[PDB]
Amino acid sequence: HWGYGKHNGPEHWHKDFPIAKGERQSPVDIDTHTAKYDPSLKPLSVSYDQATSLRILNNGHAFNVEFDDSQDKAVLKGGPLDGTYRLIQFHFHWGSLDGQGSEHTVDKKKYAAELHLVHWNTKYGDFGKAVQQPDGLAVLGIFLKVGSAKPGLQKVVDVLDSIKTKGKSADFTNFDPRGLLPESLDYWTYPGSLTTPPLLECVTWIVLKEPISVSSEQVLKFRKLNFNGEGEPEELMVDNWRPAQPLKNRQIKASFK
Ligand SMILES: NS(=O)(=O)c1ccc([N+](=O)[O-])cc1
Ligand SMILES: NS(=O)(=O)c1ccc([N+](=O)[O-])cc1
Ligand SMILES: OC[C@H]1O[C@@H](O)[C@H](O)[C@@H](O)[C@@H]1O
Ligand SMILES: OC[C@H]1O[C@@H](O)[C@H](O)[C@@H](O)[C@@H]1O
Ligand SMILES: OC[C@H]1O[C@H](O)[C@H](O)[C@@H](O)[C@@H]1O
Ligand SMILES: [Zn+2]
Incomplete structure (x- = not known):
């Protein structure tokens, strides 16, 4: 099955998911000088105050909340x-x-x-x-x-020891995703795809310009997760990213002047 290793990683995905070579694949490099302000963009509204988190799952590729x-x-x-x-x-x-x-x-x-x-x-x-x-x-x-710790990420970090291996899940109620945002909502946007199989070309990407800072200790705990299931030889869950794909017939628009 697909993954991130040398034998099943991004360079292999096209054999089972031919859209991997499609016209609208993600991610991309964001050339900030070529990205253009778009006055037609309306104000962005991130409305998370009534969010109901349920569960956290190690799916063998990442963890999903x-x-x-x-x-x-x-x-x-x-x-x-x-x-x-x-x-x-x-x-x-x-x-x-x-x-x-x-x-x-x-x-x-x-x-x-x-x-x-x-x-x-x-x-x-x-x-x-x-x-x-x-x-x-x-x-x-x-x-x-990596710099100062992100307080709103710590609850995520601290549950990861309970979902170390593929297929494990844990209750994850009452988590507020607003604690993961940066201060500014300035963004770039473009049409693209899922970045994992099935790589479907269905996504409007909105990528915030301002990063969040997390501590070294927080990201080091991400890297203790496992791609493998319980009882199997340990494969640390690291480098679970797809590299940038060709921009092709697209433009990246900016929300800011
Ligand atoms: N195309 S893929 O990435 O889903 C894939 C890569 C490798 C194998 N394999 O080695 O059996 C299967 C499937
Ligand atoms: N990495 S991603 O956000 O483009 C992504 C979201 C959802 C799925 N999915 O539901 O299969 C795959 C990949
Ligand atoms: O408990 C996490 C979050 O859950 C939401 O449904 C509530 O409306 C928020 O006030 C709370 O921070
Ligand atoms: O034809 C001019 C137009 O070219 C397009 O590629 C740009 O997205 C527009 O911002 C511009 O007004
Ligand atoms: O908010 C996510 C989770 O954070 C902590 O793990 C809490 O102990 C738990 O009750 C909650 O579900
Ligand atoms: Zn993703």
Whole structure:
């Protein structure tokens, strides 16, 4: 099955997921000089005050913090988006060392990690239908750099010892994702794809310009997770990022002048 190793990583995915070589793949490098302010973007609204987190799962690729998406409890609207997008899960991608780990890059610079808050367009009723639509998903991406600790991340860090291996989950109620945001909502946006198989071209990407700072200790705990299942030889969950893909016939727009 697909993964991040030499034998099953990003360079192999196209053999089972031919869209890997598609016209709208993610992530991309964000060339900040070529990105253009877009006056047509509406104000972005991140409305997470009624979010209901449920569970945290090690899926063998990353860990997902899952939300109740049976109503509009935690939604993303505005910006480039037409309609309401409901938060379903968040997860991260990270490196074996602080100099890599992000999926998007900024003028080719790699951050230590990247947070993805995944949302689906409610006009399609369910996530599965949304991933049959060009505008089915919106992913809010946030870079992580290593410096001061992020207080709102610590609850995530501290539960990871209970989901070390693939297939393990734990209750994760009453987590507030607002504690993972930076101060500014300035962003870049472009049309792209899921960054893991099935690589579907359904995503409006919204990538915040301001990184969050996390401590070395916090990211080191991410790197203690395992790709493998319980009882199997240990494969540390590190370098679970896809590199930048060709921009092709796209432009990256900025929310800021
Ligand atoms: N195309 S893939 O990345 O899903 C994939 C890579 C390798 C193997 N393999 O070695 O069996 C299977 C599937
Ligand atoms: N990494 S990502 O945010 O583009 C992503 C989100 C969701 C899924 N998914 O549901 O399969 C895959 C990848
Ligand atoms: O408990 C985490 C969060 O859950 C939300 O549903 C509440 O409205 C927030 O006030 C709270 O911070
Ligand atoms: O034809 C001019 C237009 O070219 C497009 O590629 C740009 O996205 C627009 O901002 C510009 O007004
Ligand atoms: O908010 C997420 C989680 O944080 C801590 O682990 C709390 O002990 C737990 O009750 C909660 O579910
Ligand atoms: Zn992701």
